[PDB]
Structure formats: C-alpha cells, structure tokens
Design a protein around this motif. Structure first.
Motif, mmCIF file in Angstrom:
data_model
loop_
_atom_site.group_PDB
_atom_site.id
_atom_site.type_symbol
_atom_site.label_atom_id
_atom_site.label_comp_id
_atom_site.label_asym_id
_atom_site.label_seq_id
_atom_site.Cartn_x
_atom_site.Cartn_y
_atom_site.Cartn_z
ATOM 1 N N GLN A 41 0.824 -1.203 0.000
ATOM 2 C CA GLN A 41 0.000 0.000 0.000
ATOM 3 C C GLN A 41 0.861 1.256 0.000
ATOM 4 O O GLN A 41 2.084 1.180 -0.139
ATOM 5 N N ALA A 42 0.230 2.416 0.153
ATOM 6 C CA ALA A 42 0.917 3.703 0.150
ATOM 7 C C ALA A 42 0.458 4.559 1.322
ATOM 8 O O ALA A 42 0.148 5.745 1.168
ATOM 9 N N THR A 65 6.793 1.041 -7.148
ATOM 10 C CA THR A 65 6.265 -0.306 -7.014
ATOM 11 C C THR A 65 7.281 -1.325 -7.519
ATOM 12 O O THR A 65 8.173 -1.015 -8.311
ATOM 13 N N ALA A 95 5.420 -1.923 -2.566
ATOM 14 C CA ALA A 95 5.157 -0.559 -3.003
ATOM 15 C C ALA A 95 5.444 0.402 -1.859
ATOM 16 O O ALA A 95 5.096 0.121 -0.712
ATOM 17 N N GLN A 152 -1.392 4.414 -7.039
ATOM 18 C CA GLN A 152 -0.628 3.192 -7.226
ATOM 19 C C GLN A 152 -1.232 2.371 -8.364
ATOM 20 O O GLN A 152 -2.453 2.192 -8.421
ATOM 21 N N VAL A 204 5.093 7.131 -6.477
ATOM 22 C CA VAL A 204 5.070 5.800 -5.876
ATOM 23 C C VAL A 204 6.014 4.881 -6.638
ATOM 24 O O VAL A 204 5.961 4.810 -7.872
#
Lengths: 218, 205, 214, 48, 205, 218, 214
Positions: free
Chosen positions: E203-204, F178, F83, F140, F176
C-alpha cells in the motif's frame, strides 16, 4: 552624527579585557630608563636553572639535611639507595625547586626535564652508582638488574664527579628516578666513610607551560 | 609561549583594595596605593628585585544592601607629595592639581590610568640600607558630592591591573608565611619545610 | 679556572673622579674558620671596605659612589677533607628579623651589627631560609659557584653595578651581599685539621666617586 | 548604523582629560593678535 | 548551499541552561559548562565523533516577578583545573585568574567568548576506553556583589552559541530515547522502531 | 569626541546576530590542529550515502526483519510484490534512512533521488522483477501492464544482482515506487525458495535543502 | 577484488620504534560459526592482538601506540547457501548498557568482557540498535562492505589511525571496532552444512611504539 546601535556586552566590566583607560596625568613624562643588568622577559628563563631538590624530605630530618642523599660504606651492594618521582607539579621533592614553584601557577606543562647529581665526598674515595629512569606506567623497580634494563647510567666517583640524566618526555603515572648502590663505597684509611649527594633539577628548551591559575602555597 | 612572558604574567585585573564609606561619620574615605596589600600579588612581585609598570585602576562602588541610587561621587588622586584631605569639606578637594573623577552610582564603574611616578628608574621593595619611602604611588580619596550630608554607607572595590611591566634581577620565591606588611619577618621557631614529608627515602609517596 | 660573570655584563664606567692607581688593588679580608657545626657567612660589600685604606677614605668623604667588584674566594683544605660550599651574590640582600610578633612597634628588627656587619662578616642563624624567609634550595637563581673540596678550591665572581639609580651613597646603602654556606658539612678523620680556612680577596673594578664633602 | 559597545569609563568627568567641547559661539572670529613684546613660553625663562 | 554547512548547522544562539539564585540561602550559584544538557543539541553533537569550536555565552538574568532593579552582579569563569567557589564570600571570588564580569540588572545581557580549551586537538564525547574527564570546558559561578546580604531571588538564562565549529568522523543519528546524561544507555525492552507502522506492504500509507 | 545618535535596535539581544564578543582569555593560544581523517564540510555529504529503507515497517515484524522485502517461489506471476512512497520528509520507509533524518531538520528540499535494490538470495536462483516509478498525481498502479507504461526497469536475477532506479525530480502527491513479480522465482532442487531484497536510498547532486527547523523526533 | 579505503586516507607514519619485520604479518583469528539464529559479532582492535605474539608483547610493554590496520574478512560458503553480511568499522564504538534505570548509581553498565572482548570477539544482544541505541539501517555511513553469498565471499578494509591525539595507550583505549552482522539470515536446504565459517586476518600497517616501560 553617525547612526549607531548598542549590542550586548555594553556597560560591562570584563576583568581580562584589553582596553585603554584615560590617563590621570597627561603629558607627564616619567623618568627615563637606564641599563639595569639582569632583565627577564619570560618565565621559561626561570625554569631552566638548576635547583636543589629536597629528596630527603622525610621526618626526623633537620632544616638543611633535607637536601642531601646520604651514602655510607657499611652499605651492601646490588641494593637501593634512593628513589623519587619526576612530576614537578606535585607534592614531594619537586616542591622545593624553582621549576616546581613556577609550574604551579600554570595548570598544564609539557617537555623534557634534567636531573643533575653532584657527589660531595672525599677525593680519595671512589665507587659506582646506577642512576635509573623508569618511564610512566611502571612501578619502582625491585632489583638492580631490573633497573639496568630500563634507562640507566653507570656513574663512578673516581673519574666523574657530577652525572646528568635527561628525562625524555613528561605530560601533565609520572615516572620514577631511582639511584642504586652498584659496587661499593670503598675508602682508604684516615678518610670518612660517609658522603652526600646533592640532587638538582631543571627544565629544558622543550618545556612549555599553559592555562594559568593562582597558586595554593598561600 | 605567550602566557609565560612577564607582561602576561602580571597584566590582569583583580581586587587590590576594599574601602568602606559611611557618610554619617567621617564623610570621606582615603586609601594609600600599595600593591603589597594582599598576599597573592605580593608573592609575585617579591619574585623580582626591580619593576616598572603603569597601572589601571577600576572603582566599583556598591551600597550596603546592593541597590544603586543616582548619587554623584568624587574620586581624587593625590600625587606623591601633595597633602591628604583632612575633612569631608576641606580645601584639598577643591585643589585643581589633584585630578578628580565625577561619576554616579548608576553609571559603569570608574576607570583611570596612573603612569610611572617614581624619581628613580624603577620601583624596588627590597631596599638594603637606611633612608623605603621612595615609591609612594599616590593616594585615592573618595567622597559623596552633595551640599548637605547624605545618609548612605557605601563600599568601594579598587581593582588594579598592571601594564607595560618590566622586571629586573629575579629572586627566589618566599616559602615562609607573612607576619608584617612592610617587612619580610619570618618566625625563627616553627619553620615550615618547603616539601611535604613522606615515609621513607626509598619510596614513591 | 672558571670565572662566573654576574648577569653576563662587565662592570663599566658611567656613559666623577677615577683613582685607577691605589683603588684597583686586592683587599684581602681575614680568613674565616670553617668547622663541622658552622652555618655560613655573609658580607655587605660597599660597607665591608669602608674602613680599609684608600677605598675607605675615598668612600667615606664622598657622597656619590658607583663601582663593580671582582671577588675571589679561596678555600684551601687537604685531600682527606670533604664538604661543599655555596658562594653566591645577592642584590639587595635584606636581613629579616626573627620573631613571632605581628605588631609593627613590637616586632623585632635586626641591629646595625647584623644588617651591616663590616669587615668581619656575620654568621647565619637559620641558613635554611637565608635569614630572609626565602629558601636556599632555590638560591641558585643568583650568580653562584660551588666549592667542592674534591674538585677545586677557588671561586671567582665578577659582578657589575646593580642599582636603579646611577649613583648612590656608599655608607647608607649596601648594594649587594656575598653569602658562603656549607651545604654539605665538613668531615675528617681523627688527627687532621679540625678547622679549615676560607680567604676572600676583593678588587674594586671601575670605581667612580663624586661630591667631595669633607 | 554601526555596532558599538560602551566600556568602563563611560559618562565620567575626568578633570585632566584632553577632550574637545562644543563651542558656544560658532563662526565667531575673535580679535586678531598683535605683536606684544615680552611673550613667555615656559617657566624656565622665569627661573633663570 | 550555505544553510547546509556544519558551521551554519551549529552556529545559532539558544538556551543552554537555567540557573536559579536565591541570595538568602546559598548566596551564589554555580553551573558546570556542558553542551550535552538538553536533548536538542545533544542529538546534533552525537552525529559527529570529533568537534572543535569556540563558544559565545550570553547571560540574561531576570528577577522572580520580572522587574529589574539596579544591583551589581559578578559572573566568574573558572577554567578547567581551578577550584570552584565554596561560599558567597569565599576567596575564590577575589582570585585574579578567574575572569569576572561586573554587570547590572538594568544593563543589557552579558556576553563573553570562550576559546578551545582542551589539551587534545578536538573535543570528543564517545570515548571507548578507561581513564571521559578530558573536556571540562570550565565552570560559571554567579553572585550578587554587595557588602550585606540582599533579599532577592534571581533567575539566570545561559544562551550558548557555537562558532568556528569543525566536525570529524560522522556517525548515525540516535533513534532510541535517552535515559542518562553521560551514557548512551537505551532500554533493552520496548525498543522503538525507527519507522511508523502501516497496514500492509502493498500500500501507500 | 565624534557626534553620534542611537537608532532603534539599541540594547536588544538578537539570537541570530553575527556579532563579535569579548574573549575571556586573551592571548590564549589553543592546541594546534592535527590531521584527523574524515572531516565533513556540509550536510549534503551525509545525504549522498546509500541507506537501508525500512519498507517492511508493518506490524507483526521483529527488529531486523523490517529491513527486508520477502520474495517466495509459491507466488504467482503478473502480481504485485511491494510498493512505497518517495517523499523522504514524511512518515514511512524513508524515516529509517539518513536522508530522511537530515531533511527533517530543514523545511524545504528539492532534487532527484536514487533507490538501489539488492537481492540477497541463492546463486542458482534466477527470475525477473519489474521496478516501476509512477510520478506524482497518479495513484498506485493496479496491473503490471499499467505499470510497464510508466517508468520501469526489467531487472533479472541471473545477470544482475543490484538494480538502481533514479527518481527524476521531487518537490516538497509524492510519487510511488512499485516492485512487481514479473515471471517467477524459479529455483533448482536442494535450494531454498525464499529470498530477500534490501532497499536503500540516497540523494543526488541536485538535492538541495533550505529553511531550517528543529526536528520532532525528540 | 574491491578494496575499501577508510575515509580515503592511507595509514602513514608520524611526521618511536618501527619493527617492520615481525609485526607486518597476517594475524589470523579463529573462525566464527555463522548459523541461522546468529546475531552478529564485534571486535575491539588495539586489544584484539594484545595477547598474540610480537604485536602483543611490543604493545603491552610500551606506553605510546599508533598504527593503522588492513582487515580481510573471508566468508566461504557453498553455492546453495544464501544470505548477506554487513562488515563495517566504527571509530570510537562505545558499548551501551541495556536497562530501564535512570539513577546513575543504579543503572547497568557493561563489564570488561563486553566492552573489551579480546581475541574471541563478542556477540550482539540487540543488533537492530548496534548495542548502542543507534539504528543499523543507517550504519552505512561508516566504511563498510557487503558480503553477499551470491556475488563474492571476501571483504577488505584498509583503515588509518583515527584519533584526536597522535599517540595513545594500546591497552586502556580501544581505537575502533569491527562489526559483522547478518542482515539477511542464512538459509539452506536439508543435507547441507548447517553452519558456515567466517575468517578474519589482520595486518598492522605502519605501526609505531613508544615508551619502553618494562
């Protein structure tokens, strides 16, 4: 009328400040100097002079006899005669000398030292001594052959009358100078079998002093 | 190698004398300049035979409790030879040849400079002979400038600094305690040894 | 011989009369008898020769005086004696008083025969403090020599004029003092000489006199 | 606006101080000097 | 590119110590100089192994309520090795080798400068070995100059600034909380993680 | 006696003022400097060092295992692995690194970054990964072919053992990074089917910092 | 091989004795047995070789010491093992005490066998904080290498003399520490060697001794 501002530090009296003051008598010319011999410029000129150590500072000793190391003929060999520390800024034999009194006004000292012995005895009496420096960290040696492996000088009475031992480097756990009967104190008849050694001590050109402080003899 | 020079060895401010004022009931307060006062600078100036220096004098005057009220104060430097003041309102205060400093209590401390004022070429305290009244260095009177009499008791501190000091003929450092102010009288009995005692000569105490 | 020059300066004239004939002679004082229980001796120089001959006559009837000195101290003993002397000059040698009084009008002060001994010198009472409250262990800061009875028997000191004023009275002000102290005492076997002499000779180098007040 | 600090000796009136004072009459030129005979320059001329 | 230099990273004034005076009933107030006092400059000087700097000390003295009455104050810097004062009227205050500053309460705050006073070539706080009593940096006594005893309680603030600072051998920044003053003792239990937790690794948050 | 006037700002104590002070010890010379290796001149020398990110900062993790990204063989393909965000001045994986702790003393930062991966696994095990940067403003990615259109590196285990992804530009809605399983984690027999990835991160020469502020870790 | 020079400086002499013959030899310590549940090891260097041969004899009976070091850490495993080590030198590595006490006379302190381990090293208790309260995640600021069991098996670090004073005692002051930590744990299939060795060799480059106090 130039603009100006007052910063912190205004109206304070700093003791060690290098600031000029208004003279009370202006235009007053003092008496001109003449050539007085013996002017000193620094205190390092006062530390480089030999000065009798008080190595016999024990009790049951009178005023002057505290400055003398006794040596006798009824005194078996391969045996100790005397021992003292090296640090001048400490209570002991180095308190009666001048380098010790000067290095008490300052809190740090460094450099080499010089300890000079002088044999006050008869001309017809000979014999040897072992002067032995043991560096800091080591205790006082217990045998003469243990001291002979450290720093040592074999100083005899017949040829020489005054030996000198240079202390290599001491900082501000001090190092021990011992003095050993090595062979004997041999003496012909009709001559006293008891003499003395005067120990003196001074600094060298490497000796430097720093961070002042008021003394504590007073 | 700069902290060992004689100039740096002597040049530093430091208490040199405490003067008590009352303004009842003598009004004024005199003080004869002598650097042999305390036993801390006396031991440093008896190390040398001849000395030559200028002086910086700092006057820090406080009250009994500590609070500083704005009253005028007159300090007066009496050179060697001039008569000392005898009263609070004598004519020695109005003498034009006695340099005065007028300063308040709320102002920063007073600071003056005194040059070399000896008829010889250098000061000396060890005078072997008979006349040492040669180096008087002056006097420092202080009073409260006012028409009527005030009702405060002050406490002045004279801090002396030496400058441009030159020394001649060094001599050893005195080990015996002091007994007088102007004489090197020691005690014949109870002579203190210059080295603390230890147990034996064959040890490292 | 080894000659010690006091403070590295030769005695010179003022940049006044100059006798140059009868004053540059070796005034020899009487010999002092050094024994086992001796303490030391000191001499005040501009009043040691104030009663002796040409220098005394020319220094009593004048008012200004300036001269250096050349001291020679011989100490002749046998080869069976042992000991050591410390001979040193002290500028402005003030004799202290021995007592335990702090009142200025009740504390003791040395007499005239103690401060100014004359041509016969005076003996120390407490040589450990030089009779001045100052220890002799660091008395090697002055111009000095050792007379060790196993190395040599003589000492020599050339001392200039040490004063803050170029001229001074030779009667009311002693300029400097000479001190001989037996640091190591004298020892000898039975049958030898129980007391050994010490001889002092004085040469007034570069003398100057002024103000012939007769 | 240069930074500055006040040291001891501030606000004091020293008697023997060699300090200039603000003139009351600026631009006022006094009477020019003439040659008056017998000017003295030091007191050593009076002792001799 | 100028706000990231070590000199700019360290050179800034800021509270370094609070001293309480009472003048009853001890009269004086001492303070041993140490920059490891607060946990804000300790974390910046434990980032480097060796440091070398001069210091600027500012003394801001207030009263209990806040009003400033004109009383004289003496600050005294005790160099490393000199004995600390034991009383309000001891002889350590009159020692000429302890630099003093005389300033009033109504005056601007006091300001002095202290150089590098260590026998080594640089300061160090992480000393791995056994003797770190090597960097004492001095002491700072303060008292009220007065003949009698005053009846006020003061409150002094020592603000320290670093200048001409040089750093050597950087080391990581301590994440665990502090427990002592002279020792880097952490807690074996309850070890705080250096990163706040999130829900999942994919997740972030 | 020059005329002068006092302007506003007089008798004030400004904290950030660059004003000289009266020295307590004048003429005191300190100890001369020697050559101590490893002198730092700016903090940008401390940000340019690689430092292990704590990407596994979730719960149910012990002390050290928070620094490792687990990869397994029972892990189907075209599927996500990990991530994390890019902003160093924020709570997350960039809080355990050194650039994150340094950029917290300052309130603004700018420039490029660098994230270096290192595969701690067996020598006989191969396989590919997709490292994918997605710029700020985008969420994401949900698929591997959606991430393959952004910024991407196909990093295999057989040839390379440590890939490096440069983050182009970040200001002070963060971007982001990943990491996708692409093909598999294929492994021969008698070899563990479970390895780890150590993630590290540092700044670049473009990274600049400004407007200081006290930190908030204490 | 890739050699890491600590802080970009070579160890050099002081601008003291120099053995140069029997002290520039490869002192090989015993191999450490790295397993699955291992934590790490650290060594204090001027007291790791204080009991070993010529360097120990010449460093115990002297008083001043100054030398650099050349470290070689081999880690020989098979091709089926996996894992990673972090090997790093830390100047002035102070071992912290583990406890929850804030009283200076009641808080725990590490013993002599923990601060100075000797030639056998010591194991970490909490390797996540380096047993110093400081995280190992940013322990890459020191001179360091990675020993990855799929890339190489050896590491080499040449470290100079890092100290504020040019000379120091080699017994009462450890100069720097070596730390090996298995960041990624060791994994292996059944039937392989369950513990792999780690070998350390030390070369005292540019040694200087002073003050032969025996």
């Amino acid at each position: 009328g130039i603009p100006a501002e007052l910063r912190p530090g205004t109206n304070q009296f700093l003791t060690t400040d290098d600031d000029t003051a208004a003279p009370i008598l202006p235009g007053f010319t003092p008496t001109p100097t003449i050539h007085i011999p013996g002017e000193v410029h620094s205190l390092l000129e006062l530390c480089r002079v030999e000065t009798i150590l008080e190595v016999n500072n024990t009790t049951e000793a009178t005023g002057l006899t505290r400055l003398l190391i006794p040596v006798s003929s009824q005194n078996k060999a391969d045996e100790l005669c005397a021992a003292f520390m090296v640090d001048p800024g400490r209570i002991g034999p180095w308190q009666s000398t001048l380098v010790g009194q000067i290095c008490r006004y300052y809190t740090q000292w460094s450099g080499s030292l010089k300890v000079t012995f002088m044999f006050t005895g008869s001309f017809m009496a000979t014999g040897k001594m072992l002067v032995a420096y043991s560096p800091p960290g080591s205790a006082q040696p217990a045998n003469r052959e243990t001291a002979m492996l450290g720093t040592h000088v074999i100083w005899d009475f017949g040829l020489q009358s005054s030996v000198s031992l240079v202390i290599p480097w001491i900082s501000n756990t001090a190092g021990v100078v011992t003095l050993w009967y090595q062979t004997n104190y041999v003496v012909p008849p009709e001559t006293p079998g008891e003499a003395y050694i005067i120990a003196m001590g001074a600094a060298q050109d490497n000796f430097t002093l720093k961070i002042c402080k008021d003394t504590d003899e007073v | 190698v700069l902290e060992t020079t004689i100039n740096h060895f002597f040049s530093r401010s430091g208490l040199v004398g405490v003067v008590n004022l009352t303004d009842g009931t003598t009004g004024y307060a005199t003080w004869d300049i002598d650097i042999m006062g305390f036993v801390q600078l006396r031991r440093k100036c008896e190390m040398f035979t001849y000395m030559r220096f200028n002086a910086e004098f700092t006057f820090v005057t406080t009250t009994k409790n500590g609070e500083a009220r704005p009253y005028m104060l007159q300090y007066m430097y009496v050179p060697p030879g001039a008569p000392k003041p005898t009263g609070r309102d004598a004519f020695q205060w109005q003498t034009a040849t006695n340099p005065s400093v007028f300063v308040k209590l709320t102002d920063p401390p007073a600071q003056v400079s005194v040059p070399f004022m000896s008829p010889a070429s250098a000061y000396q305290w060890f005078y072997d002979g008979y006349p040492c009244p040669n180096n008087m260095m002056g006097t420092f009177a202080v009073r409260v400038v006012s028409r009527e009499a005030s009702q405060l008791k002050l406490q002045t501190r004279v801090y002396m600094k030496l400058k441009h000091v030159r020394a001649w003929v060094p001599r050893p450092i005195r080990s015996q305690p002091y007994l007088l102010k102007n004489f090197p009288n020691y005690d014949s009995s109870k002579i203190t040894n210059s080295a603390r005692d230890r147990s034996s000569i064959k040890q490292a105490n | 011989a080894n000659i010690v020059l006091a403070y590295g300066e030769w005695p010179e004239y003022c940049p006044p009369t100059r006798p140059d004939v009868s004053v540059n002679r070796f005034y020899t004082l009487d010999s002092k008898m050094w024994q086992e229980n001796s303490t030391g001796w000191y001499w005040k120089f501009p009043d040691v020769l104030n009663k002796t001959g040409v220098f005394g006559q020319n220094a009593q009837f004048h008012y200004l005086y300036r001269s250096g000195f050349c001291l020679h101290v011989q100490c002749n003993a046998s080869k069976f004696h042992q000991g050591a002397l410390l001979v040193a000059v002290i500028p402005e040698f003030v004799i202290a008083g021995r007592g335990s009084n702090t009142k200025p009008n009740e504390a003791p002060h040395p007499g005239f025969t103690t401060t100014f001994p004359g041509t016969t010198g005076a003996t120390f009472h407490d040589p450990y403090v030089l009779d001045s409250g100052v220890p002799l262990s660091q008395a090697l800061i002055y111009p000095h020599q050792w007379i060790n009875l196993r190395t040599n028997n003589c000492a020599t000191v050339i001392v200039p004029y040490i004063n803050a004023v170029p001229f001074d009275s030779a009667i009311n002000h002693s300029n400097f003092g000479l001190i001989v102290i037996p640091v190591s005492p004298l020892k000898y076997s039975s049958g030898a000489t129980t007391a050994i002499p010490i001889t002092i000779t004085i040469a007034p180098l570069n003398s100057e006199f002024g103000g012939l007040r007769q």
